[PDB]
Structures are given as C-alpha cells and as structure tokens.
Design a protein around this ligand. Structure first.
Ligand code: HEM
Ligand code: HEM
Lengths: 129, 129
C-alpha cells in the first residue's frame, strides 16, 4: 500500500496540539518549571513546541517559517537546565504521552526521541558524555 | 522524517494476529457463521485472513506464497453470502477492531476497507450496484 509520515500516522496536528496542552498543563502545576519561564501568558511557548514537534515528525515546516532553523541548545543556553529540571520536564512529557494512548510501537518512537532530546538538552556539567 | 506502511504503523503482525483472533472468537459464538464453515478445527481459516490482511496493508507477501494471487469472490463464490451474513461478519469485525483501540485515523482506515470489502463480497441479488 501507500506510505505515511509519523506525523500523519499518529493522526496529525490535533495529536500534537493535545500533547503540548497536557504537557504545559503539568508544567503550570510544577513550581520549579513555572519560574523557568519569565512572567505569565506563556501559552505562546506551548505553540512553539507544538509547531516544532509537528515539523520534526514530518508535518508542516511552519516552525521554521516563524522561528527559523531550529537551534535547540542555543535557545536552551539561556537556561540553567540540570537533572532535577529535565527529570521534571520528562515527568510532564510521560504524563502527556499516556493521554494520547498510542499503540506501543508509535508511542515507543515518540517517547524515546523526547527522552534523548531532554537528556541531550542538559547543559550543566552533570552528565556522562 | 522516514515513512512507513500501514502494516508497520498499526504495529505490525501481532496487531493482525490479534484482530483475527477476537474476530473468529465471535464467529465461533455466532450460530449462522459457525455452520458457514464446514466441520471443525477451522483455526487455519483464521490464519488465512490474518496472512491476507498482513499482506494488504503492506506486510509480508506470505499470503500469496501459499494461497496465490488473492481471488477474493472466487473463494467466496462457494458460499451463500447475503445481508444477514455480512452484517454478522461486520459485527464481529467491529468488535475485533475496538479491541485494538487504534487512533481514530488509522482505525478509520482499517475499518472502512473492511466495511466496503464485506459489502462488496455479497453475492446474492440483494445490493445496489
Ligand atoms: C531538558 C528539559 C527542558 C527544559 C527544562 C526546557 C525548558 C525550556 C525553556 C526554559 C525554554 C525557553 C522558553 C521559550 O523559548 O519560549 C524552552 C524553549 C524551547 N524548547 Fe525546551 N526545555 C527542555 C527540553 C526540550 C526538548 C526535549 C525539546 C524538544 C522537543 C524542547 C523544545 C523547545 C522549543 C522548540 C523551544 C522554543 C524555541 C524557540 O522557537 O524560540 N525543549 N524550553
Ligand atoms: C461478507 C461477509 C463474509 C463472509 C460471510 C465470509 C465468509 C468466508 C467463508 C465462508 C470463507 C471460506 C472458508 C475458507 O476459505 O477457509 C471465507 C474465506 C476467506 N475470506 Fe471471507 N467472508 C466475508 C468477508 C470477507 C472479507 C471482507 C475479507 C477480506 C478482508 C475476507 C477474506 C477472506 C479470505 C482471505 C479467505 C480465504 C481464502 C483462501 O486463501 O482460501 N472475507 N470467508
């Protein structure tokens, strides 16, 4: 038969719209991570992740066309990101993923990227690589 | 990113192995359809559907290499297939699909084929086409 991108497979945009929602929802409820972002009305940050992930899994290039070529740890250098940090991020991401209730194969693929991507992002001298 | 077949998307063989299981399980429990197949030990029929559907969604060509080019209503001409029949088949297929609990997009694609394919298969002069 025909072939498809992960984006279309996990059911397209609404999926990612949902993922980021249940994510920041928990981020809101987290003390250390509420601080992490300055001020309030930080619902546009939600849009970014959303647009990025859409783009990563083979969706709309939208993210680039507003935020350019994704320089990830550049945009993460501003921040004091350590274990405690990442761990809490991931706990909100774990929660966010179970809510999508994907087939194990896809879920395994999505979650694994985000597990690396958050372990990668850590910038303080804590890790082994 | 990379692309994938529906087969791999819905998580490959175990998915289809499961689909046919919960299907024939209900077929077993159905009077009209238990008759439909002669004698007993009709668990190999389960294997066929399984192998076929695997093949259809972009899986292993296995089905052909044992049962040849799939001539569907040929292999269905032997049988007196009407509405009541198909309807009961579909009810076991509906049940079988909900158990996989797929994302709506994929589920919608799988189920829709099988909805047509069973409406197509009907051979008595009942339908509109
Ligand atoms: C290690 C845990 C992480 C923490 C503590 C964290 C936190 C942050 C912070 C504080 C910002 C800046 C706010 C903003 O730019 O609006 C940010 C931005 C961003 N993060 Fe993370 N993040 C983490 C991991 C990740 C991961 C794994 C991804 C990839 C899926 C990601 C994707 C992004 C994106 C796309 C932006 C916005 C960049 C832009 O377009 O300006 N972050 N994150
Ligand atoms: C309309 C309702 C249907 C009824 C009542 C029905 C019933 C049957 C019967 C009585 C047989 C013969 C048993 C056998 O060959 O072992 C059979 C065979 C088969 N059916 Fe159906 N069927 C229906 C729809 C479908 C559909 C929609 C598909 C496609 C997904 C399908 C796929 C097959 C396959 C692959 C075989 C075995 C052919 C072979 O390799 O010998 N059937 N079915």
């Amino acid at each position: 038969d025909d072939q498809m991108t992960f984006y279309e497979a996990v059911g397209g945009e609404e999926t990612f719209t949902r993922l980021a929602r249940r994510f920041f929802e928990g981020v809101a409820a987290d003390p250390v991570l509420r601080p992490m972002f300055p001020e309030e009305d930080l619902g546009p940050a939600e849009e970014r992740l959303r647009l990025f992930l859409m783009q990563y899994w083979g969706g709309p290039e939208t993210y680039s066309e507003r935020r350019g070529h994704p320089r990830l740890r550049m945009r993460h250098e501003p921040y004091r990101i350590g274990a405690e940090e990442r761990d809490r991020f991931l706990t909100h991401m774990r929660a966010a993923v179970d809510d999508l209730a994907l087939p194990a194969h896809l879920e395994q693929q999505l979650w694994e990227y985000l597990v690396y991507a958050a372990y990668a992002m850590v910038n303080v001298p804590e890790d082994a690589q």
